[PDB]
Amino acid sequence: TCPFYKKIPGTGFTVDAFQYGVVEGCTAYFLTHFHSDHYAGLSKHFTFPVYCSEITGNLLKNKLHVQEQYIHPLPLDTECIVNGVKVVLLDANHCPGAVMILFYLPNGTVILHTGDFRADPSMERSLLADQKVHMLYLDTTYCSPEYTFPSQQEVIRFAINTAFEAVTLNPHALVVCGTYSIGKEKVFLAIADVLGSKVGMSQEKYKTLQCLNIPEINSLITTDMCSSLVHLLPMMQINFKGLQSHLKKCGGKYNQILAFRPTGWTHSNKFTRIADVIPQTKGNISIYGIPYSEHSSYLEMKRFVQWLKPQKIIPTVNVGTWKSRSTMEKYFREWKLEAGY
């Protein structure tokens, strides 16, 4: 049944709750972003109102064929009224179109649902700064101190320098980047830009990227693989067998692959700096796993919460085990005692 942490008390609202059938007493279904664990259950036969960002609304219509009459896109950073309740959508610094949702309950309670997010000090100057938040439904994906990772900027610097060096040394090297969902587009876009190429991909992936309002996108991507030296493939194909196969398909245009897997975290991070990352190699194929995260590190998460000072925290991630739950609740208490709220 729908779990309590997807329900907004004092409202007819749910968040990211599309796989439980008709939820008793839900008048509006919010969707924070277009990732499959969150939209699981939506299709063209859905007949309740869906509230979301403009970009999420492009994807629902074009990829899942939800009918337009049931899609309710809202602008960001704007006070809006939904079934008599004031809401605001804020940028979540996750994937394109991902939002956090502020709800202003009729009784005076203020609730923030982060969706999936990567906490950033820039959020400390949105409409969040202007009032107190009583309850926080928090993306706790990496809520443990072992989860450190570099900034997105440091990681892109590494990938750009790596790719530019490899291809300048060997003009017949191909760069491949893996993907399985929207998000992390900077990886492949920044590499293509330094090499002066477009990124080549399947028709299905080109379609998906055309929904994202990325400026100058027609200048950056293409379905013509033959004209491109950066190719996108399914994440599943980023291994030695899958890459040998793809190299065969390129018809002797290339004699070397350098491939990137943007992982979230990998325990090489406890010991190793980004400077120090090395690939796995077999023959003329090298694979780098790079720690490009679209979720908060433990420190980023801590700073956000100690700034916000919520009265109650409700985790939305890692809630399935008692050990996880008890570990998170210990960190919440430390943070509160250290900051004094």
Ligand code: NI
């Ligand atoms: Ni997500």
